[PDB]
């Protein structure tokens, strides 16, 4: 029920800055990062596939806005139409030197932060009649989502070599409630109401719009994977998408945390996100969705 039920207290021999000396150290590893070998014997999960380059502690994962600017002889045309779905003529066009600041927020199932719609929730699919195509919903009013890892983590440094340090979770104290995200129940209900209203235009007024939760697959695809405060969350979002629509309170999403990240859906290049000292707190805007329809 606690955060401590998600952790394994793993002890191992580590190299010292002197090649001929060893170092009996320990660290708290999440159960999602250790795989048993058959005080039992375990090993890090991405160890038969690659070696994990440690997420370098002095570089931040916070996305800064980047503008993509066209070279000489080219121009960037910007569609200023407010009802422009994603395709076809755009009556109002502009030539911008280059785009607005696009924050590269990396997330799944929910478009955290970013740009809102102008007048109404926009539904954008390559072929709305094809269930194999994702539907990019864009909100007009953001839905605020609050993260947390209540634990007061204690980062610990291990010298694994000359000049190289390994940052490990030495101890965990404080509030041991599981990491979670809160979405306002009233705000989310009226946002799905707007999504449903704009979604019946493509399927019928008398059709029944039902939101179910993710089908299956990797934890990166079945969960609202995202980064917040340098530590990577994987939230359930099964209480967000659970409703059937016929023609102060809050929603708490239990989130797991991992330290070994295979981010860009690749195999062979993992990354070890080092522990973040202290309590992590999070304020984001849900500005969109990525939906898939059932055949």
């Amino acid at each position, epitope marked *: 029920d606690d955060m401590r039920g998600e952790l394994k207290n793993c002890s191992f021999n580590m190299t010292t800055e002197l090649r001929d000396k060893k170092q009996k150290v320990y660290s708290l590893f999440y159960r999602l990062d250790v795989v048993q070998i058959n005080n039992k014997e375990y090993r890090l999960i991405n160890c038969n596939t690659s070696a994990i380059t440690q997420a370098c502690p002095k570089v931040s994962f916070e996305p800064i806005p980047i503008h993509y600017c066209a070279p000489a002889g080219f121009a960037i045309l910007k569609c200023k139409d407010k009802k422009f779905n994603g395709t076809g003529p755009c009556p109002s066009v502009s030539t911008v030197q280059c785009t607005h600041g696009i924050k590269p927020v990396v997330s799944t199932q929910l478009l955290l932060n970013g740009s809102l719609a102008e007048e109404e929730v926009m539904i954008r699919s390559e072929n709305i009649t094809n269930n194999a195509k994702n539907i990019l919903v864009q909100f007009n009013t953001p839905v605020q989502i609050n993260c947390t890892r209540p634990n007061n983590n204690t980062r610990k440094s291990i010298r694994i070599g000359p000049g190289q340090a390994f940052y490990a979770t030495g101890d965990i*104290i*404080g*509030d*041991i409630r599981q990491a979670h995200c809160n979405v306002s129940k009233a705000t989310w209900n009226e946002t799905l109401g707007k999504v449903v209203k704009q979604l019946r235009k493509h399927f019928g007024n008398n059709t029944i719009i039902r939101f179910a939760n993710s089908s299956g697959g990797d934890l990166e695809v079945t969960t609202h994977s995202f980064n917040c405060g340098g530590e990577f969350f994987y939230c359930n979002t099964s209480g967000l998408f659970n409703s059937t629509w016929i023609s102060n309170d809050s929603i708490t999403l239990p989130c797991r945390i991992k330290q070994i990240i295979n981010m860009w859906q690749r195999i062979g290049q993992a990354m070890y996100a080092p522990p973040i000292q202290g309590v992590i707190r999070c304020v984001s805007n849900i500005t969109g969705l990525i939906l898939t329809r059932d055949g």
Partner: antibody, heavy 127, light 107 residues
Framework: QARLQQWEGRPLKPAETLSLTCGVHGVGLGGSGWGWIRQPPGQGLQWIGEIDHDGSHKHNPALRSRLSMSLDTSRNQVSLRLTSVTAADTAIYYC??????????????????????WGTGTTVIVS | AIQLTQAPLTVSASIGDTITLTCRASQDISIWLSWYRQMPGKAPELLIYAASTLRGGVPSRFSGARSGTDFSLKIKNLQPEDFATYYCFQSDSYPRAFGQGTKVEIT
């Protein structure tokens, strides 16, 4: 067999440096914290200061800027360097190990420090 | 800082009695209050930590209670080794403080 041994430093002249040393046997300086407790004659005990597990130096407000402690990890010794000793500092000085046990209140986990292991006593008299 | 008030400063009882010692704090220090016994001429020793937990080796006669302000220690089946000076020590705020000391003697 775990004991803290400290030896008498003999009487010292007023307005000097008070150098104490505690010998840690059975256990080592790591992991716990080490502090100093005194006891003026016919009176109760008084807290001087401690070094906690983190290596951080808690000092009593009454003794301002005249306090300094150190840990000899190689020799397993705890040192006290009280300066400008006045006649009111005539007391038996004890070396203690503030041990950390975690006690779980309803939802909160704390490191509780409770001076597990006491020295034998160093009667310091200034005249 | 936090001031611990320990009363009565001198309680007298014969061998085979039951005594209750009081240590009142200034603020609320939760349950972090340990008890130390100083035999005359010896060094103080830990009896009770966290106001309820008995130290390894202390007989079951010793017992504490309360987690607010009026902390209490109860001794049962008094023996000559219990006639010493008891101190209550708080561990909530970093300006640590001791009690005044309750000298328990024979009548």
């Amino acid at each position: 067999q775990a004991r803290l041994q400290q030896w008498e430093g003999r009487p010292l002249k007023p307005a000097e440096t008070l150098s104490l040393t505690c010998g840690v046997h059975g256990v080592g300086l790591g992991g716990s914290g080490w502090g100093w407790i005194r006891q003026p004659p016919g009176q109760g005990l008084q807290w001087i200061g401690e070094i906690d597990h983190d290596g951080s130096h808690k000092h009593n407000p009454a003794l301002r800027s005249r306090l300094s402690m150190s840990l000899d990890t190689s020799r397993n010794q705890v040192s006290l360097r009280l300066t400008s000793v006045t006649a009111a500092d005539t007391a038996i000085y004890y070396c203690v190990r503030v041990y950390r046990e975690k006690f779980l209140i309803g939802e909160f986990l704390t490191d509780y420090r409770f001076m597990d292991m006491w020295g034998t006593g160093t009667t310091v008299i200034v005249s | 800082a936090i001031q611990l008030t320990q009363a009565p400063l001198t309680v007298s009882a014969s061998i085979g009695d039951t005594i209750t010692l009081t240590c009142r704090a200034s603020q609320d220090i939760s349950i972090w209050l340990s008890w130390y016994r100083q035999m005359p001429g010896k060094a103080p020793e830990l009896l009770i930590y966290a106001a309820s937990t008995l130290r390894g080796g202390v007989p079951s006669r010793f017992s504490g209670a309360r987690s607010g302000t009026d902390f209490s220690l109860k001794i049962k089946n008094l023996q000559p080794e219990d006639f010493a000076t008891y101190y209550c020590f708080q561990s909530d705020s970093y300006p640590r403080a001791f009690g005044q000391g309750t000298k328990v003697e024979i009548t």
